[PDB]
Amino acid sequence: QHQGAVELLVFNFLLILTILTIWLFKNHRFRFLHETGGAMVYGLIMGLILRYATAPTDIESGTVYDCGKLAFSPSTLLINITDQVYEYKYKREISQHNINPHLGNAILEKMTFDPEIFFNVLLPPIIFHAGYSLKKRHFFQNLGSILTYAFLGTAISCIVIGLIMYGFVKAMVYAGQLKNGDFHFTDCLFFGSLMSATDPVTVLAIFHELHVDPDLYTLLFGESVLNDAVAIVLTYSISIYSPKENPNAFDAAAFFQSVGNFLGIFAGSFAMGSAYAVVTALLTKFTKLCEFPMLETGLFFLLSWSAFLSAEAAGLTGIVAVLFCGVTQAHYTYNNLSLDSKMRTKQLFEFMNFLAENVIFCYMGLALFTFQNHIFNALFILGAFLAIFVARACNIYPLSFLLNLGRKHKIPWNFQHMMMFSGLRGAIAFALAIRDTESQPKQMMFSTTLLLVFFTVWVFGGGTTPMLTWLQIRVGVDLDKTESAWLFRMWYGFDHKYLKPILTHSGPP
Template sequence: MWLHLQMRKAWKKLPAILTSLLVACAAFVASAPSDVELDEKAKVNHRLDSLNILLYTILLSLTVLTIWSFKHRRIRFLHETGLAVIYGLIVGAIIRYSYTSSEVSHLSVIPASGSGSQGGLNLTVPPDSLWLLLKKGPATLPKNKTYAYVFKGEISDSESKQIEQKATFDPEIFFNILLPPIIFNAGYSLKRKYFFRNLGTIFTLAFIGTTVSSVVIGAVLYGFVQVFGTSSEFSFLDTFYFGALISATDPVTILAIFNDLHVDVNLYALVFGESVLNDAVAIVLSSAIQNYGEKFSGENSGGFNFAAFSQSIGVFAWTFSSSFAIGGAMGCATAMLTKFTHVRDFPLLETALFVLMSYSTFLIAEVADLTGIVAVLFCGICQAHYTYNNLSRDSRLRTKQLFELLNFLAENFIFCYIGVSMFTFPKHHFDTVFIFAAFVAIIVGRAANVYPLSFLLNLGRKNKISWNFQHVLFFSGLRGAIAFALAIRNTLSEARQTLLTTTSVIVIVTVIVCGGSTTQLLSWFNIPVGVDDEAECMQIHMRSMYTPLDGNPKPDGSSADPYVEGGPPKPQDKALLARWWQNFDGRYMKPLLTHSRPTLLETMPVFCTPIARLLTTTEQLTQERVEPINTLSGDPTFAHFEGQDVRRLFP
């Protein structure tokens, strides 16, 4: 009886249920075409993204194979970065002139009056996002739909194709993903022995030299623009901003050839050390100039504001020093973690912690509105100097090889992208007059950096920087990844678009031409090659070890290397700052952050014994005393005496 009543109730509700099902089916059928089209559009975008990544993967693969072929045949007239640029140019031209897909669809809209989140639209600043409302209709949509579009920038070519747009990356990818491993590896692979030996010279060339170069380039360009005029309007700040960003050198091509030929380690240290710090200085300097322009130039109608200039100098000093402090602190924190924990028993976890702590250094500095590149550079130096000693043997090998690989891939990807973007980037603006003036300006700026400062440095140096070394330093001012990344970050105005195009042309020309002529340059200037690094490291090198590139020894038996004259380097040959730091580092920093001897119990005052004991590990107390000797690669080896066993240092 109960079942019969339930069936009668259900039968009465059946018409309503069928009506609801019919309405739902009708709505589904009406919306199906739009959903199918959206799915198809998503598939097309996915295929284009995959094609874009595939293109760059093929470019990198071709670069690797060509590098192997060149190394196998000992060909040095073209470096891997030059190859990457050339391959990128070829692929960019193919994309630009041979791809025949349909163009990107566009919908032109005009903002309604009174729109915007605050009740009105600020026409001087574009909104962060755009909401497109499509209303329902019998022939269009079954219901209202709203789509959100994110701001990407001002368009310059409405006829651009999808593949061209996909081949162009967000500039933030360079700063947040590609540059950190490059800069970190520069610090992590630093040959610290020779870096600190030439610390004063490197600091002078990097800090004072980069500033001089920026000012000279900016002044020359501004004068050229005022006298001859250009197709774009450049302000005083535009030319000085360009002077700062283009002063970032990237002699990766020359350094690779130096390494292959075993060029004098002191010359290598000067070129490498100056370029590493030079990048950091150029980034902070360009940021300070941009900060001056954004905050203060409008207050004085574009004129010079001394108070604003002084404040910008303060911002420069604060940004650099704070970024340096963050990088050093994170490096020391990682060293403490690896010293006082047993994470080394699990090499995979140890390596993961090392990588995450290193990358977080960059992010912390960026979040604090500082410069992550500077922070990650000094973090890399600290990691190599302290943390590396605490790592297990597996983690040492993994971290070295991992960052070498990331550096290789990131650097060659950037140079490939520079070549591709010459044809696909929509905001290039070619100004032949300005490009020519820029080449003249960077030559004058580099000369004003190297030669006068070398003369002043030689007044106080016992080991003089020879003219041949100065010529190589001048020639090593190639432009590369840092300059391009700074230029592509802001291309809103026509002047900034011209700066990007000029920077790209300068990078391509200097990498291909200057990088390809490095070997011949070394021969012209009789730069010593074939230097025995181990003998140099052990300070038993002889003049006969130095051979010019042409293979002909000096007739008088002397060496072309100015550092060899007078015998092996002595402690007093080091810079005063380097000697002071070496003493402080050996007595306090290394015993605190590593397992090295002497311990803090031996070096700190007696009243600090409780703290010293807390900061000293059992491994430090039980091991025999060893003396660290840094090899050329910066990795510590250990000399043991009286048959002492140090195998436990290398688990």
């Protein structure tokens, strides 16, 4: 053995060093760096010192066998050797036999992770923690604004990024860097959808530490929570798009079915999450598990995991379903659990979220582990930077003005610049980029996204405090109907009229 133990120990040591450095920085109050940035820089240092440590070594090349009557590559295969049948499993495709002697040199440790690990065990805890951690104060008078942002602006930014990337691809074809025809507008739309999820975790941490006005913090948190799921589902829908004939056509009568599939997946995920939440709320309400905190906590965790697994198995997107289940749980079941169970669940979920985000950023800081990197064509990177900048610019101001037209007597002026400055890219974009491999445009997009994240997270973590001071943003503020489209008040009345007396308000807490 002694294969995964070494890499896991290295990851643990890097996490310990990151925690120690964060404690040292916070002791001197230097700031200018977050735990995510520390983890990423430590991962970069580890990769740099591992790449150039034992590069001169032997060359290992795998043997080639001429397997006759083999026109397909099944996932599972049975090979009969010495009158004994052995099972072989297909894992990954490596089509770099030409550079195989170079790959053998400086092999060191691959330290690679399966792309589904980030989607099955790392992201869902973070999504559930984000959904459950609702202040339950405010976030409702501006809920419509958050929804309008996270819906319209994400699509607008995706379209703008796709158009600008298509234009830059045309310019490159004019320059003739490589072959013309490989890139397509579908790839541009995929890249735009991928570069639409924002997770300003450092910005949110700074806002919480400095006690900024809760309105801007709630708006940013809601946007970051919703746009991640919106971008994930949009990326899945774009990946579904496949015309029957004339590939990469325009208006091939498949837009309507793609939109229908998107709406159906979103509605199914929301319905499944709500159904699981109401089922567990009713189960807790009828039972008297308030005297057994361990049993009710375990039941809650198992029910949440079962909801996630049911969402994944049904063919829908598990992230959005988990988010909706978590927010509905925090809305309803939080008033029925015992006092100790609430604290236990909150501590467990926040610890899991912290560990998951630390591991995610530590692995993201590892940039030298991938041999199939395509970091070149600086014009492409510059075009991507301009596209994301202009997409962020057009996301806020037009929607902000449109909301200010029918504004609810609360003008959010001068806060748009802070939203412009908060343009971090979270783990969703990295996971989506790393999901697809062995493709030149995919590798180029992954490298560009990684470089953009490395630049933007560091620069915005460095400049958040000067930006806050320059805009005269109020800090240190203690947290302690008709205007709402006439629909939010009706929903609140309906909830307090029928749902509340049956789902809660009775039973020992």
